[PDB]
Backbone:
């Protein structure tokens, strides 16, 4: 009951370049006729985002600088999206960070600084984004964050980022419980591994890809467009009965041991 | 871009739907969504006497032809000859929606420790094994791959008051879904479950525990409301189509978030 | 708290010196519990008796129970009650599946095979719990053995995997049912161990080889380690724990 | 024959460090009681200067030949590092650690979870989760033959529980922390596990919103139809800290009357 997203409006957070999971999301939602608003942190992502948008069908470029480490910029940014475009239907959250040092060494060796930075950027950011986005969804809508199986199970070399994704998945459940009575669904997609910018020189990544290929039920890896397709289902009314959920888009790998 | 692109378009696709009893059946919610989305639909039913009502029910869909097959999933021969006949009459298919379970009332009403052997094995057979043999037979009609979806309940994952023998059968079903996904994945067949919140169907009539948990969902669930058959139907169309192309071995909860809280 | 003298336990499913249940018995015997054993078939009893000569039981309490039969499970526990009195718990270490179903494709599983594995490996716990409850009027503890393949699709575990998923739910529903009777019901989820029922799985050494390489503890587990956790779960030490599944698997359950 | 009673758990010759006793109602004092009854040499850590003397009062309730107390605020690397280094010098090698430390700002707990402060979110994560990571790294220096580390969690780390809010996100992080430390430290023969306790009326639970209601719910709905206490957490701790749980690592044992298993 509802196959098109015309008249829908979504914010996409965390496109960095053509290989971003959030750009797969953007491409999909754009082909379904949604208006899209984009948020970036640093500059090279702006001059990039302007270039990538040329591939989309969007009749105007709504681009806002939000570093989610600043409550101010989150609060001001969403307030401004509100003034510029009005109410929205949902947010796609494609944002995380861990220090390379921490991931390279033993988990027991993780710095206090790296642990809290990963938490702040990869989990708390969803909390304050939801709180501010809600102000633009007076009738409800849908919030989707991106996670990885390493938040549910200890995965070799994922280390501090795993604890941050475990924190994130709890965040989704608690937000879902908090925001449900306001008609706002909150859900995660647990993407299988995908070769993005931030996957570059991560140890454990290439071998994890090969392992998926050999052992996952579908015997192949997933891509950004496949995440995008599940994101469209979660952000639309097709999943209207569905909240606090974590959909694995990972070729079945979560289901096997 | 001159046109609205569709998230799901099932024109020229064919799906087998098993387990429609009447208008309030979860599977009829599935049927209404898939029909509206353009699918050709094939229906199966347990007993000869149910055909007439089923066919009369069917007419309010937009199916330019009625495809109805008698299949009691207790009988290997009826499952095998049934899907064989479907193949001969309509061709290859894209998927199967499984909405079939049974547990004895006497077993359900007793204490779980008092469950009868006979009723335990009957619940396993109809509610779980039936997915295995339907998947084997339906695979023959899916030479390029497809999608199979079964219907389960949260009581397969946790002890829910009164759900008793049916909870054990649903746990067996959920694991059936995972092993089938692993077995059939290399053939491009995805196998998934929808864990539906409680819905007022024919089968829910007179089942102890049902109303208690329904009122609990309304009070405590994140959405503070119960789901309907059409919301199961919308999730079924996601799983059964290419919108869910990387997803297999999964159990999507359509239950207002109740699964997520304690 | 620390010694099980003056406790009594029924142990179901010792086959031979390599059975997980014999790990359990050695352990319980060492802690001074009185033990009562069940076995499936009569031609088996004499060689069970010789095995139990290695324990410190003064008296061989041995009862023949094939858990496919209501009547034998009923009369078996009746006899135990009349012969030894009340008990403090049961260790359930029984399972079966036809070997053919485990290394054909899962979608090819036969109906007869599927249900026989459900009957023996899962329903048996329910009826045993029901009859054992009669010997436990101030409460007690029942423990079943499971494997990770009841939680995730483990390659080739197939119909046993579905049976073990059935068993783990059976454990939770029993815990809820019998909790107000002060009876706790829990599972141990053992890592793979080289028992007699493991011979005949093709590639079993390669499976032990994955645990050694990848599990947090980088080693496989043994029958006596299962028994140590069994003693915890069968004693008052775990007095607040019911409906639980403890993995005794060198931490494999926790990694991906 | 056997001429003697085998012992499930004998802790004589074992030494354990216990972090997070505030007072008599602490979950960690219930742990202390059970380890001391079993013969363990215990070493205690505490947060403030001023709480020291009153902790020493508690101790004489125990069979300890001498008071080993070390001031350690887990927010400060130096104090954990120095604290363990000193324990090693004063006492020598150890057999495990029991971690019973958590904090969440009351103001955060009392708002809607969506209103949680950044400062409070990170403070919860630091004390309630990161602290396990650094304790493990330091304790391991005193565990060359290996040993056992246990942390204390709650079901609201696994499911959204009304009013647990930011502490629930912190327990989620802790439960992951536990799995990652299990994987990292397993080759060193160090096991790492959690106990997920049912609600217990401790000093920290006082003033906490949602607590009393859940206590009643447990008595009514849990399989054992009763609440657990601190000594019951202690006995499961003694299992996890000892060789009785050899082979068990990365696990979360629910000591909660079966409530986790129902819906
Ligand atoms: N790649 C994979 O295999 C998997 C990734 N994920 C998750 O998917 C999401 C997207 O990552 P991915 O596409 O891999 O790679 P990208 O590196 O393309 O995207 C990550 C984005 O996070 C942004 N970001 C980082 N810190 C901040 C901050 N302080 N404020 C605002 N934005 C910030 C980056 O912005 P900037 O322009 O500042 O770099 C970038 O746009 C993440 O949550 C990731 O953990 C989940 C499963 C697997
Ligand atoms: N209602 C609810 O609250 C929930 C239901 N579910 C599940 O959804 C599915 C559909 O249930 P629901 O719509 O409630 O009930 P319905 O009674 O509407 O439909 C159940 C169907 O199963 C059929 N069936 C039973 N035994 C057999 C058999 N041997 N061979 C073939 N078909 C058989 C019934 O046939 P007949 O009428 O001929 O006997 C009927 O068509 C079931 O798996 C159920 O467990 C899951 C979660 C919650
Ligand atoms: N070995 C392993 O790797 C693992 C085993 N498990 C589980 O541990 C338990 C013990 O297995 P294990 O020790 O390996 O193997 P064993 O073969 O030693 O023991 C299994 C026992 O079950 C008995 N049994 C089978 N059918 C019946 C029946 N109808 N009535 C009564 N008893 C019956 C067998 O009887 P008989 O002697 O007549 O054959 C045998 O004594 C099982 O539940 C198993 O699935 C769990 C994790 C891994
Ligand atoms: N009570 C319950 O219902 C449940 C509690 N838990 C968990 O059990 C554990 C113990 O809780 P509980 O016994 O209730 O309450 P307590 O209040 O007795 O214990 C909490 C302890 O943590 C110490 N602590 C806090 N911050 C620091 C810090 N910066 N450095 C060092 N120590 C610090 C406190 O010190 P101080 O006195 O200096 O403030 C106090 O001793 C916690 O992890 C809690 O989350 C789990 C499930 C349920
Ligand atoms: C944003 C970011 C940063 N800053 C550092 C490391 C990783 C990531 C994002 N990312 C990237 C890759 C990924 O792959 C999961 C598969 C792996 C397993 C172990 C290590 S990688 C998951 C994932 O979360
Ligand atoms: C087909 C069938 C039969 N023969 C017997 C009982 C139940 C069902 C179908 N059904 C119906 C309702 C349902 O409700 C879930 C909520 C409940 C909780 C406890 C009891 S019912 C789940 C569910 O599976
Ligand atoms: C009693 C029985 C029968 N009749 C048939 C198969 C297996 C068993 C017992 N067993 C034996 C081995 C085992 O190993 C787990 C690891 C495996 C993975 C895939 C196949 S085995 C688990 C396990 O359950
Ligand atoms: C140390 C601390 C601080 N500083 C603040 C809040 C909670 C706690 C410890 N605590 C205390 C009680 C508790 O009870 C679990 C039951 C609950 C459910 C909802 C609210 S309480 C869990 C729990 O973790
Ligand atoms: Cl009939």
Residues:
């Amino acid at each position: 009951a509802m196959v098109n997203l015309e008249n829908k409006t979504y914010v996409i957070m965390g496109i960095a370049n053509k290989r971003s999971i959030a750009f797969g999301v953007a491409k999909v939602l754009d082909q379904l006729g949604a208006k899209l608003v984009f948020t970036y942190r640093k500059e090279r992502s702006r001059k990039e985002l302007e270039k990538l948008l040329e591939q989309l069908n969007q009749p105007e470029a709504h681009l806002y600088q939000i570093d989610v480490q600043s409550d101010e910029e989150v609060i001001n940014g969403f307030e401004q999206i509100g003034k510029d475009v009005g109410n929205i239907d949902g947010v796609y959250h494609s944002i995380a960070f861990a220090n390379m040092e921490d991931l390279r060494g033993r988990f027991s060796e993780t710095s206090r600084e790296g642990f809290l930075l990963a938490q702040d950027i990869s989990s708390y950011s969803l909390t304050i984004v939801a709180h501010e986005a809600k102000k633009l969804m007076p009738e409800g809508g849908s919030i989707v964050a991106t996670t990885y199986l390493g938040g549910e199970f200890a995965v070799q070399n994922y280390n501090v980022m795993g604890v941050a994704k475990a924190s994130l998945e709890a965040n989704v459940k608690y937000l879902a419980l908090d925001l449900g009575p306001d008609n706002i669904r909150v859900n995660a997609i647990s993407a299988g591994p995908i070769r993005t910018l931030s996957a570059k020189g991560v140890g454990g990544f290439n071998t994890i890809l090969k392992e998926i290929e050999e052992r996952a039920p579908l015997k192949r890896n997933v891509d950004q467009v496949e995440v995008g397709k599940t994101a469209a289902y979660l952000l639309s009314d097709l999943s209207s009965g569905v909240t606090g959920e974590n959909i694995h888009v990972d070729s079945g790998f979560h289901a096997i041991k």
